[PDB]
Amino acid sequence: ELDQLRQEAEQLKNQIRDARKACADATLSQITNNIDPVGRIQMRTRRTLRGHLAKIYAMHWGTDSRLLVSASQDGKLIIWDSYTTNKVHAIPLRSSWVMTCAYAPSGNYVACGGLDNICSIYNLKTREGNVRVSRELAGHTGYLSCCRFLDDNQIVTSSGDTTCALWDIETGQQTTTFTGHTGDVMSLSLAPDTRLFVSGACDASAKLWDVREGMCRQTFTGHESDINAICFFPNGNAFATGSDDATCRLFDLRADQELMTYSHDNIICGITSVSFSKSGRLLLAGYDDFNCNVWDALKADRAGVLAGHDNRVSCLGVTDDGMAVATGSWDSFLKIWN
Amino acid sequence: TLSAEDKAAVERSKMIEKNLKEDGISAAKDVKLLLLGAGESGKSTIVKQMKITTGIVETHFTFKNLHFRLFDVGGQRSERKKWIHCFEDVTAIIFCVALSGYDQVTNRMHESLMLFDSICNNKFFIDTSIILFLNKKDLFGEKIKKSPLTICFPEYTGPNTYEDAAAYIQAQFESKNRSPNKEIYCHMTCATDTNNIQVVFDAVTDIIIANNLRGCGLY
């Protein structure tokens, strides 16, 4: 009965493709032939945060747009003050192989993970002074890639065992598991309402999960290689995926199909991180060729370059008020731009 | 100054920067290695003879006021290229090859040759030297006395003795690198051998000295 079900699946995917073709009447480029180009957006380095000793792999901003977190293989998770370039905490880790970090929306907790298959949670506002480990979550069978905080009580992680999970920090138990991917999962971004999220895997596909029922809702497939970074549009109806084939694309949730791709024949190195701006008019993407790029998200033309790093940029993120953008590369440095 | 204390915060920053520097200095006297190979190639044997559970498994040992960290990563059953970029900047790579590769799993020796070729020409390991261990040298003698070597390499032309065949195998493995910035060290090791930590020590010292000479510009 395998052949019959295979034919049924082929018919289903043919119906999907026919519906996608029918639902498209024009392109976002055609409708945006009249808007005013943003011109050359020149940004300058404001601060340089130099405390680390090895390559930086992850970084997350604070909710108040002032405090910052960074992780690296020197075994440290040190959080910064952006305005004064001060160091306010330095958290030593148990495993030096760290590839993700998070900073709680309330500001009390941080998270960390890596090749040790464990997501650790730290308490910053303890009564006795120094920061301590609160929970040590261990349910995955592969390296973690990205973890985001729903709130102070529940967290969501994505691992390289083709699964994603939602945890209850108080009990420490894997409340829900999400399955359906084929290769390693490498990215994750939460909605503004934190009611659903997406994830991009190494099989060149991105899925639209729902945190309540734990069932995938939509599948987007346009890329040709592994996807390394996802980020929602500020209005929560689109996301941009940066893949390893030196291109990034914008997908729309309702239209269920690709809208526009951002590519240039002079670019051959792959993407490592993607983030938007406060209004969605700009797309910032890290690159393997030692620098960053700014894309006019509505016109698909380059609008600036953020040079100053002499190695791969691995993390990138704008503040919650849109005032600044921070990048961090493998040269153990981290910059702030306005 | 115009600081409103607002100045013990700066003092705290200086103290934890001092702690970071002290931690960094004390973490530069330990050598980081990386053990690679295949099953039944004896890569567990070298760990066993060196003195003193998913994720990264280590073999934490020391020798002669130089500290070592041997990372065995054979247990990560996932995509290799997605976490080998974080394993660069290691001092050396230990590769274990079994000399009794005279059977299918193709011939095991050919798989070892292909994997060595893949690992010595990766973009992250173009400048990292490799120390090569040829394991199971006692079995090889009787294996070659019983069976010829032409089963593995058809184009072999020479004596069927231990020395010439061993030299041919070693040359075949050493002819896989093209970068002039790295060197391959080799050693014939039996199943039970007296010293294998000295061979890592006196090779890591040479690697460090060569790196220092290149960095200074005196090379």
Epitope: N130 | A9, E11, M15
Partner: single-chain antibody
């Protein structure tokens, strides 16, 4: 869990010396800043000394400089005060406070319990005045307490360094609101503070029988730290 207990007070003849100790247990002593605060038998609180984490910076009051010495031994997590050539005006009760400092921290959060000390007979400071002295209150009513200064406390950073303390009778002071409207940890939501520059107020809603005592205001803009006379609340 967290405990500050002192010892070393008693009867001292004028011209002698004494050594006060502050032994802490329950927190990371080595990464905190510690103060010494004394209180006269009937007057208010007065600041004495200060030593920072790592013993980097040490400050002294104007009336004890050259006679008192403050030092800490954090491997054995105890704090000391060496006193020399006591006078009849040094008789008071000495307290021990911890003042961790970083971005967003809450200084002066925990206070010690104090040791008595009795001795027999033998300009640029920021003065802060609390015009109110004592007012009667009844449960279920809202009252306001005001504390005014002489220099503006609004630094260019946007911070305003005003601290409010509560001292119930036969007890050590607690921290209510710090710098200048933040609510401390463990203090109810009834208390609230407001002000600007040199005029400040503390708002209490739905007063009960448990929050009766004397309220004090302190400044942390620049050393030496200056307290106030305090306002006493009593049942009508």
């Amino acid at each position: 869990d967290v405990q500050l207990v002192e010892s070393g007070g008693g009867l001292v003849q004028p011209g002698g010396s004494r050594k006060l100790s502050c032994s802490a247990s329950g927190f990371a002593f080595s990464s905190f800043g510690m103060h010494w605060v004394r209180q006269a038998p009937e007057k208010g609180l007065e600041w004495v000394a200060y030593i920072s984490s790592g013993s980097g910076t040490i400050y002294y009051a104007d009336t004890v400089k050259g006679r008192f010495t403050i030092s800490r031994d954090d491997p054995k997590n105890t704090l000391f005060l060496q006193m020399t050539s006591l006078r009849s005006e040094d008789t008071a009760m000495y307290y021990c406070v911890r003042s961790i400092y970083y971005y967003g921290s809450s200084p002066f959060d925990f206070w010690g319990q104090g040791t008595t000390l009795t001795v027999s007979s033998g300009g640029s400071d920021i003065v802060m005045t609390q015009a109110t002295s004592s007012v009667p209150v009844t449960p279920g009513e809202s009252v306001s307490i005001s504390c005014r200064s002489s220099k503006s406390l609004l630094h260019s950073n946007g911070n305003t360094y005003l601290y409010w303390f509560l001292q119930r009778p036969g007890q050590s002071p607690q921290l209510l609101i710090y710098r200048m409207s933040n609510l401390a940890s463990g203090v109810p939501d009834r208390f609230s503070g407001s002000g600007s520059g040199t005029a400040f107020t503390l708002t209490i809603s739905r007063l009960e029988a448990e929050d009766v005592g004397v309220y004090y205001c302190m400044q942390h803009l620049e050393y030496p730290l200056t307290f106030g006379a305090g306002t006493k609340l009593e049942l009508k």
